[PDB]
Design an enzyme around this catalytic site. Structure first.
Site, PDB file in Angstrom:
ATOM      1  N   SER A 232       0.865  -1.196   0.000  1.00 20.85           N
ATOM      2  CA  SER A 232       0.000   0.000   0.000  1.00 20.85           C
ATOM      3  C   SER A 232       0.909   1.257   0.000  1.00 20.85           C
ATOM      4  O   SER A 232       1.990   1.189   0.561  1.00 20.85           O
ATOM      5  CB  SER A 232      -0.780   0.018   1.313  1.00 20.85           C
ATOM      6  OG  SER A 232      -1.761  -1.033   1.295  1.00 20.85           O
ATOM      7  N   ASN A 233       0.431   2.382  -0.552  1.00 28.55           N
ATOM      8  CA  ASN A 233       1.089   3.672  -0.333  1.00 28.55           C
ATOM      9  C   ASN A 233       0.084   4.616   0.336  1.00 28.55           C
ATOM     10  O   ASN A 233      -1.155   4.493   0.158  1.00 28.55           O
ATOM     11  CB  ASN A 233       1.475   4.322  -1.720  1.00 28.55           C
ATOM     12  CG  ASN A 233       2.270   3.388  -2.571  1.00 28.55           C
ATOM     13  OD1 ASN A 233       3.257   2.781  -2.104  1.00 28.55           O
ATOM     14  ND2 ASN A 233       1.870   3.242  -3.795  1.00 28.55           N
TER      15      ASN A 233
ATOM     16  N   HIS B 192      -2.883  -1.428  -1.193  1.00 25.20           N
ATOM     17  CA  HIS B 192      -2.632  -2.531  -2.151  1.00 25.20           C
ATOM     18  C   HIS B 192      -3.123  -3.830  -1.506  1.00 25.20           C
ATOM     19  O   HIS B 192      -2.515  -4.303  -0.563  1.00 25.20           O
ATOM     20  CB  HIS B 192      -1.123  -2.664  -2.388  1.00 25.20           C
ATOM     21  CG  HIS B 192      -0.505  -1.474  -3.079  1.00 25.20           C
ATOM     22  ND1 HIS B 192       0.840  -1.171  -2.983  1.00 25.20           N
ATOM     23  CD2 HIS B 192      -1.050  -0.492  -3.838  1.00 25.20           C
ATOM     24  CE1 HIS B 192       1.100  -0.067  -3.657  1.00 25.20           C
ATOM     25  NE2 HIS B 192      -0.027   0.376  -4.184  1.00 25.20           N
TER      26      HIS B 192
ATOM     27  N   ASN C 197       4.934   0.794   3.331  1.00 22.22           N
ATOM     28  CA  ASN C 197       5.184  -0.551   4.009  1.00 22.22           C
ATOM     29  C   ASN C 197       6.585  -0.715   4.499  1.00 22.22           C
ATOM     30  O   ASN C 197       6.996  -1.786   4.894  1.00 22.22           O
ATOM     31  CB  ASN C 197       4.984  -1.740   3.061  1.00 22.22           C
ATOM     32  CG  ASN C 197       3.584  -1.783   2.493  1.00 22.22           C
ATOM     33  OD1 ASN C 197       3.397  -1.778   1.279  1.00 22.22           O
ATOM     34  ND2 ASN C 197       2.585  -1.857   3.382  1.00 22.22           N
TER      35      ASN C 197
END
Ligand SMILES: N#C[C@@H](c1ccc(Cl)cc1)c1cccc(Cl)n1
Lengths: 164, 546
Positions: free
Chosen positions: B1-2, B23, B269
């Site tokens: 993920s961002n 994500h 992450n």
């Protein structure tokens, strides 16, 4: 009863649920989600109940790609009646209401579905759900950060025999 | 993920702004679903939630937007048991022999013949939790076994916690509500508010051990590879109690990283450390956050964010839709040089041309250079000492960088990696002139839809994870619910998409409509005010009761 919701959908089937309380709010969510994803939820609840091998046999896998029988042993161990009852007893009244409204709105969609948006219509695992089922899903997501990553390893853990 | 949260010191309007690009899988029990929930007068929140959950997990409200990424913190610990030398079903704690407990579960299994049989299985448990066997690594022999204590098994607060976040007014209120309940299981939280505050919290449920206990309580070989492993034969290695923690044995909120700024915070992450390099987060338990090299998505994002120029909504959208393969920035200049140094070496010809013609992107139209680059990078990763500049703790943003072609053992190994990658690529059934979009797709009934993006491990912000299925790469997870939120005077302006669409059912009108949009990278309004909702010409309404 005392369950009511007003649901508006904008483009791409995004629902907007308005209700006067958490039970009605959960009723609209559960009904709108079922319209789009009744089969997915029924499947994931089957997994979280540890009943995959019972509907599908030992040859298939869950959507997390675990074999059905090790996945069932893991989720039967995780979601034992005493764990679910303690989890329920620790929920706030608002969260309890959200969950009761959700199960009732999902079951209402299922009572009425004629297949327009539900490809698994008539399968024996497409069944009414209960608040304990949504606690089973919750616990399954909680442990995805932890013992859930070792589900196969839990199932494999057996003491040694006579070997050298 | 961002996630990127921008504040008043860096946004173009002097208010908050949030990019949420989690994500997650495109199927199954973590498949996101959009919804907007309103109890008029006391709740109005919109975003996306997970199957079965009557709360919004990532979303926004009148003055706040928030999102999550998976953290690097430990959420369980393994315990190594010293077995009783007389009985491998007993284990020692402080020298005393304890019996394992047994819990049997009974499963029904449907057979070849359609009938149900019953299978009984015994789960062994220690005072820590169940035992776990990973063959060749965590065995159960006559000397030792491993038990696993998961801290979220007692986290009964998770749904109340998200319901509470859904009711939050601004960043300060969000922080109070998360630090008070400590119900978040295993993700970071990042947020921005209308006033222009940008917040990062590594606030989740993390097993607590006082710092003086760690060195003797750790299992040194296992911690070496990042498994949270403790000595289970010593009672002083039990999780530490602290009455400030919301749950017995977890870390108090005061000891978990938090960063509140008016410029930006970001996470892809990695640990809390470089959430914003102008203020490193340091000094935490190794169970919480460590100073490790950051992956290429974070390096990419930090390369776009640092400096003094204002950030517009458009800039954050384009960090996703550019599909830039940032790992190429580190190796492709040196690699093309190796290619020039080896011209007319015929094993390398197709590879080197594909690489030189490549736009360094994971766009639908991106050339087969991307596929050569991936298979080369898979090999480059398994090489030792091949970086021109290796990781440097004092330059964590710009290292590692470049190939050490000035070392003949490296030039030979790198050349060989490129020949092996090129062979693999040529052996597969890729046509001539095929693009990345001809290969990576999402199946929808009997059709396919081309999907832009690529694996996060190659520094593509728009991370998309795929697996080989027949003649294609089939998308299985990545960019999922996208929301980009700003706060103009009228009410929050949110734009995004749910990449895989609302419905997993092929019969639904909403099985692929947003997926077609995702393919063309055309984000849409997320309508929130009654004015936005009512302006929608597809508006439909149903009221229900029982
Ligand atoms: N932590 C955590 C999990 C999580 C875990 C449990 C529940 Cl009930 C809800 C969420 C998570 C998963 C996917 C996305 C997000 Cl945002 N958070």
């Amino acid at each position: 009863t005392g369950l009511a919701a007003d649901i508006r959908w904008t483009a791409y089937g995004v629902p907007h649920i308005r209700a006067k309380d958490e039970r009605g709010l959960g009723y609209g969510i559960g009904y709108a989600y079922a319209r789009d994803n009744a089969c997915l939820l029924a499947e994931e609840i089957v997994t979280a109940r540890g009943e995959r091998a019972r509907y599908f046999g030992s040859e298939g896998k869950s959507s997390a790609e675990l074999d059905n029988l090790p996945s069932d042993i893991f989720y039967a161990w995780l979601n034992q009646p005493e764990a679910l009852q303690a989890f329920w007893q620790a929920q706030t009244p608002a969260v309890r209401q959200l969950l009761e409204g959700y199960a009732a709105g999902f079951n209402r969609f299922l009572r009425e579905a004629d297949g327009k948006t539900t490809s698994c219509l008539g399968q024996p695992w497409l069944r009414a759900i209960a608040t304990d089922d949504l606690l089973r899903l919750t616990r399954r997501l909680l442990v995805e950060g932890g013992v859930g990553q070792f589900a196969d390893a839990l199932v494999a853990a057996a003491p040694p025999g006579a070997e050298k | 993920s961002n996630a990127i949260a921008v504040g008043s010191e860096r946004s173009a309007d002097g208010k908050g702004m949030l990019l949420a690009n989690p994500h997650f899988p495109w199927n199954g029990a973590m498949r996101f679903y959009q919804m907007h929930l309103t109890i008029p007068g006391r709740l109005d929140v919109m975003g996306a939630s997970l199957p079965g959950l009557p709360v919004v997990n990532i979303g926004f409200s009148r003055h706040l937007a928030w999102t999550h990424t998976v953290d690097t913190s430990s959420h369980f610990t393994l315990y190594r048991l010293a077995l009783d030398p007389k009985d491998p079903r007993r284990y020692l704690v402080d020298g005393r022999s304890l019996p394992l407990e047994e819990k049997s579960v009974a499963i029904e299994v449907r057979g070849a013949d359609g009938k149900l049989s019953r299978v009984e299985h015994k789960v062994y448990q220690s005072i820590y939790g169940p035992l776990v066997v990973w063959p060749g690594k965590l065995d159960w022999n006559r000397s030792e076994a491993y038990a696993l204590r998961d801290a979220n098994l007692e986290n009964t607060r998770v749904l109340q916690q998200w319901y509470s976040i859904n009711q939050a007014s601004d960043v300060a209120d969000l922080r109070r509500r998360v630090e008070a309940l400590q119900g978040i299981p295993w993700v970071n939280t990042l947020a921005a508010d209308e006033q222009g505050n940008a917040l990062y919290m590594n606030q989740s449920v993390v097993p607590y051990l006082k710092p003086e206990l760690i060195p003797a309580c750790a299992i040194p070989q296992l911690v070496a590879e990042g498994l949270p492993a403790l000595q289970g034969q010593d009672s002083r290695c039990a999780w530490s109690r602290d009455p400030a923690a919301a749950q017995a044995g977890i870390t108090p909120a005061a000891q978990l990283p938090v960063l509140l700024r008016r410029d930006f915070v970001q996470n892809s992450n990695d640990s809390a450390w470089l959430t914003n390099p102008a203020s490193p987060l340091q000094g935490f338990s190794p169970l919480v956050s460590q100073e490790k090299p950051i992956g290429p998505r974070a390096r990419y994002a930090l390369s776009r964010l640092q400096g003094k120029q204002p950030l517009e909504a458009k800039t954050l959208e384009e960090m996703v839709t550019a599909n830039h393969v940032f790992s190429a920035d580190q190796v492709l200049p040196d690699l093309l040089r190796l290619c020039r140094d080896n011209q007319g070496e015929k094993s390398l010809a197709r590879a080197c041309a594909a690489l030189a013609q490549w736009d360094r992107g994971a766009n639908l139209d991106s050339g087969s250079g991307f596929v050569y680059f991936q298979r080369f990078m898979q090999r480059f990763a398994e090489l030792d000492g091949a970086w021109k500049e290796p990781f440097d703790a004092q330059r964590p943003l710009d290292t590692p960088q470049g190939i050490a072609l000035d070392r003949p053992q490296v030039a030979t190994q790198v050349r060989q990696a490129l020949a092996d990658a090129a062979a693999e690529v040529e052996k597969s059934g890729i046509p001539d002139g095929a693009r990345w979009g001809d290969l990576q797709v999402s199946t929808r009934g009997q059709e396919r839809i081309a999907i832009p993006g690529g694996d996060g491990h190659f520094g593509v912000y728009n991370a998309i994870q795929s697996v080989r299925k027949g003649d294609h790469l089939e998308v299985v997870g990545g960019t999922s619910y996208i929301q980009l939120v700003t706060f103009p005077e009228e009410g929050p302006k949110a734009r995004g998409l749910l990449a895989f669409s609302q419905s997993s059912d092929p019969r639904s009108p909403h099985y692929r409509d947003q997926t077609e949009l995702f393919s063309r990278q055309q984000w849409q309004t997320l309508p929130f005010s009654d004015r936005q909702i009512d302006a929608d010409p597809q508006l439909q309404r149903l009221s229900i009761r029982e």
